[PDB]
Every structure is written in C-alpha cells, then in structure tokens.
Write a protein that binds this ligand. Structure first.
Ligand SMILES: *[C@@H]1O[C@H](CO)[C@@H](O)[C@H](O)[C@H]1NC(C)=O
Lengths: 49, 49
C-alpha cells in the first residue's frame, strides 16, 4: 500500500434481559376459592416456578 | 399475595324477547261490555307480570 485511511465498525453485545415475575395464584385461581382448594393438591409446581 | 378489590355492585342486562301483550291496556278499556255481551280475548306468546 501507498495510501491509507481509518475506518470504523460498530457491534452490539447483549448483557442484560428483562426480569419477568409471574404470580401462580393470580394466574391459575385468581380470586375463586374452589379453584384454590382444587389446586392445593399440586402443592409443588408454584414454589418450584 | 396480590389482593383483589371486591366488586361493590352488580349490573345485569338481558336482550329483550317476545313483546308484551298489554293486558292492562285491554282491562282498562272504556267500552265496558254488559254481562250479556261478555267479551272474550285470547292471549299467547307473551310475557306478563
Ligand atoms: C491519500 O488520499 C487522500 C484522499 O484521497 C489524499 O488527500 C492524499 O493526498 C493521498 N496521499 C497521497 C500520498 O497520495
């Protein structure tokens, strides 16, 4: 080469992510009581989630 | 736990149906017939209170 210049290039790298929170009761058995009494059998999925 | 506000009132609306026969309009007629000319009227497919 006998003549040169400077070029620029951009790049993006993801670091974070939106934090999503889900409520088990308000999603499955929001307000009703019979739904809660029936869901009390599955007493491990919500805590694991 | 996520609390939910309880509903205060209840609003019920139902589409109408077969029209009223207006028994009171016929009972309040001004042409009162005689016991010899007793008037008979038939009513069906109505909704009376
Ligand atoms: C290199 O290129 C630039 C832009 O075209 C010019 O201004 C400059 O004179 C050149 N250099 C030489 C040594 O030709």
């Amino acid at each position: 080469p006998t003549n040169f210049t400077i070029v620029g290039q951009e790049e993006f790298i993801q670091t974070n992510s939106p934090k999503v929170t889900i409520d088990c009761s308000l999603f499955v058995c929001s307000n009703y009581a019979a739904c809660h009494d029936l869901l009390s059998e599955y007493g491990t999925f919500c805590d694991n989630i | 736990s996520g609390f939910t506000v309880k509903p205060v009132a209840t609003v019920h609306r139902r589409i109408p149906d077969l029209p009223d026969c207006d028994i009171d309009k016929w009972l309040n007629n001004f042409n009162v017939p005689s016991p010899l000319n007793w008037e008979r009227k038939i009513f069906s497919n109505c909704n009376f209170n």
